[PDB]
């Protein structure tokens, strides 16, 4: 019961509610256990709360699954920090070490809540003899597949050993499943409920991408007079939301060669507003110190580059991101705070072909070492098509993650203006 | 989301005729969209699917029979049979494999949706 639950989370989690609704209805139903569960958040968001509560819940033990056994160590220590029980199954444990976990699986009734296992040892024949008996003893109450991306080559990740996880499920199905992903892309999400083998009926709970604080739109080169005073009117506007609040939160300028990003930082400095490289080019403690300046009101936007605060004005996109992911997540950077923020995208025709030319480089390089390849080069196209669209931005983000499209009445582009939004299409139609 | 069907009846031999399966909701795309026989005692057996991206499947005695067209964009599907016969005659259903719904709120469902049935005899 839910009773039950937030007593729990009080317990291990040591907070009052679930921190998002779906996070807390995913749990439920994961706790129900009627059906598989496909889970999909962004870090952060408590998914290791999700599926750690109901296999605390359960009277059964419950079979977690991770790829990277760096995560499986940070995972078990979290929960050994709290309350639940937890244990680890990695080969690089002393014998005696794994000789004690594999007892203790093989005991009726174990102690153990949740038990980690990576996939390769999952596959293993050592951990085969154990599955078979607690599938006799019919022990596991749940199996928990995290970052289940993986199985999808598509995904941004991948791992082959997940093809043997789907046979592993189909062992023991009568434990229900919880797939858990950083980003579902709806092709990845039909590929990772096929490879799994899960039940076809599957309760999805997936964060909508749209946020009534963010706001999406794209200016093109071509159609700007120039694109430089274009970036410092956004600049300005997005760093006081009125004239009484003046200059305020944090500005982030993204480009794909460094060079680049310290020639616009050059341009935005000759033109007025203080701004920081933070590219390649400029050195690791230069790099810091660039990162603090901007974290501070000291720099209103710098240029961040490659890599990346508590509250961020907006976030430019001189060059637009190779892949529409990498675009959404340098966008989620903007906007993290309660208060409303802004993003704008710079794509143009000579932009576009850089950008496809970097792709195409990319995927040779690539195949020299498809599917995922592929995906790759969908999402670049994918981008391409968002900032060549006609409609709603956070629509199109939304189809691209396969969610719900919003319903953006406020702080959508397209739904403001969507006459200057179809005259700017014209415009860049008759230029091109 | 339940299924429905559309523009089932009786047509003498030699005589095409259109079907149509339509969803409830909103799915926001379908894996695919495959059709079932069912005849007095006997279990339904596929004939053939539609799956998105152009992809369709058939059988021999299904290809020559009819012809489908399914789209998730439209969210239904529709079979046309061409010079039907007395032989091929039984009632349809859909399979919705893969049905991906969703809200705002991210409580969404993966099952796949059967409908009512459609039947059809030829003289």
């Known amino acids: 019961p839910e009773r039950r639950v937030r007593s729990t989370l009080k317990k291990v989690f040591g907070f009052d509610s679930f921190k998002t609704p779906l996070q807390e209805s995913a749990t439920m139903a994961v706790v129900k256990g009627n059906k598989d569960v496909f889970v999909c958040m962004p870090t952060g968001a408590g998914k290791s709360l999700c599926y750690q509560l109901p296999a605390l819940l359960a009277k059964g033990i419950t079979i977690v699954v991770s790829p990277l056994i760096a995560l499986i160590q940070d995972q078990v220590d979290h929960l050994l920090t709290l309350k639940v029980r937890v244990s680890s199954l990695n080969s690089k444990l002393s014998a005696q070490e794994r000789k004690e976990l594999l007892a203790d699986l093989e005991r009726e009734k174990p102690q153990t809540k949740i038990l980690y296992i990576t996939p390769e040892m999952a596959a293993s024949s050592s951990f085969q003899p154990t599955l078979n008996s607690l599938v006799s003893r019919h022990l596991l109450s749940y199996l928990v597949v995290d970052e289940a991306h993986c199985v999808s080559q598509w995904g941004h990740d991948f791992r082959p050993d997940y093809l043997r996880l789907g046979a592993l499920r189909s062992r023991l199905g009568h434990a229900p499943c919880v797939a858990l992903t950083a980003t579902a892309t709806p092709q990845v999400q039909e590929d990772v409920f096929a490879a799994l083998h899960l039940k076809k009926p599957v309760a999805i709970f997936k964060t909508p991408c749209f946020r009534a604080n963010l706001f999406y739109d794209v200016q093109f080169k071509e159609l700007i007079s120039d694109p430089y005073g274009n970036l410092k009117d956004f600049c300005l506007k997005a760093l006081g939301q009125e004239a009484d609040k003046g200059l305020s939160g944090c500005g982030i300028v993204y480009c794909r060669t460094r060079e680049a990003c310290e020639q616009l930082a050059i341009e935005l400095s000759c033109r007025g507003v203080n701004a920081k490289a933070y590219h390649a080019g400029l050195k690791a403690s230069e790099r810091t110190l660039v990162q603090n300046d901007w974290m501070e009101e000291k720099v209103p936007v710098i240029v961040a580059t490659i890599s990346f605060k508590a509250n961020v004005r907006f976030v430019a996109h001189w060059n637009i991101a190779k892949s529409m992911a990498g675009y959404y997540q340098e966008s989620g950077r903007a906007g993290r705070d309660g208060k409303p923020s802004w993003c704008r995208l710079y794509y143009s025709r000579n932009d576009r072909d850089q950008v496809s030319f970097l792709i195409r480089k990319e995927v040779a390089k690539l195949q020299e070492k498809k599917a995922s390849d592929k995906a790759t080069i969908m999402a670049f196209d994918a981008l391409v098509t968002f900032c060549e669209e006609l409609g709603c931005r956070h629509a199109a983000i939304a189809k691209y993650f396969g969610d719900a499209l919003p319903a953006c009445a406020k702080g959508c582009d397209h739904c403001q203006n969507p006459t200057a939004v179809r005259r700017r299409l014209e415009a860049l139609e008759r230029s091109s | 989301v339940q299924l429905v069907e559309n523009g089932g009846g009786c047509v003498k031999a030699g005589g095409s005729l259109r079907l149509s399966c339509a969803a409830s909701?909103?799915?926001?795309?379908?894996?695919?969209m495959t059709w079932y026989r069912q005849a007095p005692g006997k279990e339904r057996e596929w004939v053939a699917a539609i799956t998105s991206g152009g992809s369709t499947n058939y059988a021999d005695s299904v290809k020559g029979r009819f012809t489908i067209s399914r789209d998730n964009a439209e969210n239904t599907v529709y079979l046309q049979m061409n010079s039907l016969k007395p032989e091929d005659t039984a009632v349809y259903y859909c399979?919705?494999?893969?049905?991906?719904?969703?809200?705002?709120?991210?409580?969404?469902?993966?099952?796949?949706?059967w409908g009512q049935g459609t039947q059809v005899m030829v003289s």
């Open positions: 909701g909103s799915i926001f795309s379908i894996n695919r």
């Open positions: 399979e919705a494999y893969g049905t991906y719904t969703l809200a705002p709120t991210g409580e969404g469902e993966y099952d796949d949706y």
